[PDB]
Design a protein around this ligand. Structure first.
Ligand code: ZN
Lengths: 84, 49, 49, 49, 97, 49, 49
RNA sequence: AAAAAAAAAA
DNA sequence: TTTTTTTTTTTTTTTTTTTTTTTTTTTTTTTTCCTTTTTTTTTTTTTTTT
DNA sequence: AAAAAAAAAAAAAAAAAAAAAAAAAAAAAAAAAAAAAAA
């Protein structure tokens, strides 16, 4: 049940529950020796690198938001806009 | 303490971890660091094989 | 949780009570018990006419 | 006797029925006594491990 | 302890009665020292003082618990307060104030 | 006395309240639904904030 | 780490904290955290996960 | 090692 | 000789009583005591007799 | 010196208060069917 990109009705803003699991999954990926999409300035804790490449929206995660009628909308990271 | 036992992650802890909206902390404290197990299940009957 | 947490604090006004009206009214947590349980017989039914 | 033994294997707390007499002066702890309760298998071992 | 001695003396008389009825139906006599089982009174008082369940050992579920307690030896005042304690038989679950 | 008697029914009321509403969640369409998907509120708190 | 006082009444009764390793043997927390935990520092025991 | 009881702490 | 009118017999509800059943805050720390028992049957032993 | 009866040791056995929902029994009015009187 792939909803088209023009027909997405969910919010365009990443809430805290998406942010926590995206940061955790990306930190686990960097800790398991994935390539780092951005430059480095001496950060060693991979959760800091996870925020650092979340600022430039360079994280390859597709969030599959589930509507209550068991349909899903796929949103990229760069399609969402950070707020804190 | 005398039997070297862990802490009781009771019902109210589960309640307020639901209230925090943290699914992974609940899955950790209630499946990962308490009693994980793997079972083999028949697809047709759904029972332990 | 945000409705059950004030129920623990519904005993601080127990003292310094004398009563001005002689009207039967259930107050505090048992009155809460009358509204959560939907009691078909309340302890103090009253009409405000 | 067979019906009594089967039922008190399953359920030991039903009124009107003779209690399953364990050796040490206690009733039998049946499957229902394992599951039902605050310290049972649901509340004390699954919601609260 | 008087009530405990009533129960244990009744059990002793029942056991003595059963022994002498077993040995009277065969036409023989009996010995009084072999008739009295001395473990009954001693074992009953020892059990009901060590355990605290105030009654028969087989029927301890109908008996009151916590009548006999281990004496608290932490301070002298704790021992004096434990020796001068009064317990109400109302259970510790009553909503009535 | 008032601090002891109550605390039991207050905790029982809290457990009942948390068990009646443990799966009510704001969904991605803004509506508020329970575990079975039954609609409760079209917006959370009637304003979605 | 996750820091928890029992009984758990609301959401802020178990919260996240950062470990600072200190010399003696008690879990030393700040004073402004006494209000959400309902701690009293009179022999209160408290849990860490 | 289990079960029960009692005394307590917040 | 048929129609109305009284009687009967179910029929469904009502209402009150009785019975049943299920429930009783969260966590933590120490001891003590028991985890058989008398009864009945079976087997071995000891003494006595021819 | 061999065979039988009674006594003692060893082994298995059974013996609290509250509140809501459901079931039940006496009652009670209502409605349809059957029997009798009259025109
Ligand atoms: Zn199968």
């Amino acid at each position: 049940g792939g909803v088209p990109k023009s027909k997405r009705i969910t919010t365009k803003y990443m809430t805290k529950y998406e942010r926590a699991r995206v940061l955790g999954t990306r930190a686990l990926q960097i800790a398991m020796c994935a390539p780092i999409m951005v430059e480095l300035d001496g950060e060693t804790d991979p959760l800091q690198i996870a925020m650092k490449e979340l600022k430039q929206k360079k994280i390859p995660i597709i969030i599959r938001r589930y509507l209550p009628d068991h349909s899903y909308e796929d949103w990229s990271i760069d399609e969402l806009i950070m707020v804190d | 303490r005398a039997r070297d036992g862990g802490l009781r992650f009771g019902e109210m802890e589960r309640d307020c971890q639901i209230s925090h909206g943290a699914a992974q902390f609940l899955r950790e404290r209630l499946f990962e660091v308490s009693d994980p197990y793997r079972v083999h299940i028949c697809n047709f009957c759904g029972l332990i094989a | 949780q945000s409705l059950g947490e004030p129920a623990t604090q519904m005993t601080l006004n127990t003292f310094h009570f004398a009563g001005v009206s002689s009207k039967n009214v259930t107050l505090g947590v048992p009155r809460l018990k009358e509204i959560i349980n939907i009691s078909k017989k309340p302890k103090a039914p009253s009409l405000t006419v | 006797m067979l019906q009594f033994h089967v039922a008190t294997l399953v359920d030991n707390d039903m009124p009107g029925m003779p209690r399953a007499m364990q050796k040490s002066g206690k009733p039998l702890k049946a499957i229902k006594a394992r599951l039902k309760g605050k310290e049972g298998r649901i509340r004390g071992n699954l919601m609260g491990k | 302890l008087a009530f405990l001695f009533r129960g244990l003396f009744k059990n002793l008389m029942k056991e003595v009665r059963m022994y002498t009825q077993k040995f009277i139906d065969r036409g023989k006599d009996f010995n009084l020292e072999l008739a009295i089982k001395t473990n009954i009174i001693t074992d009953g008082l020892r059990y009901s003082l060590a355990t605290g369940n105030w009654g028969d050992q087989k029927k301890a579920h109908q008996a009151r618990a916590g009548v006999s307690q281990v004496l608290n030896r932490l301070t002298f005042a704790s021992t004096l307060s434990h020796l001068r304690r009064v317990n109400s038989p109302i259970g510790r679950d009553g909503k009535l104030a | 006395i008032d601090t002891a008697v109550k605390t039991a029914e207050t905790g029982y009321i809290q457990r009942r309240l948390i068990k009646a509403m443990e799966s009510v969640m704001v969904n991605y369409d803004g509506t508020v639904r329970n575990s079975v998907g039954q609609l409760i509120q079209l917006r959370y708190g009637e304003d979605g904030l | 780490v996750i820091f928890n006082r029992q009984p758990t009444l609301h959401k802020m009764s178990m919260m996240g904290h950062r470990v600072k390793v200190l010399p003696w043997s008690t879990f030393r927390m700040n004073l402004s955290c006494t209000s959400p935990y309902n701690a009293d520092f009179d022999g209160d025991e408290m849990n860490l996960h």
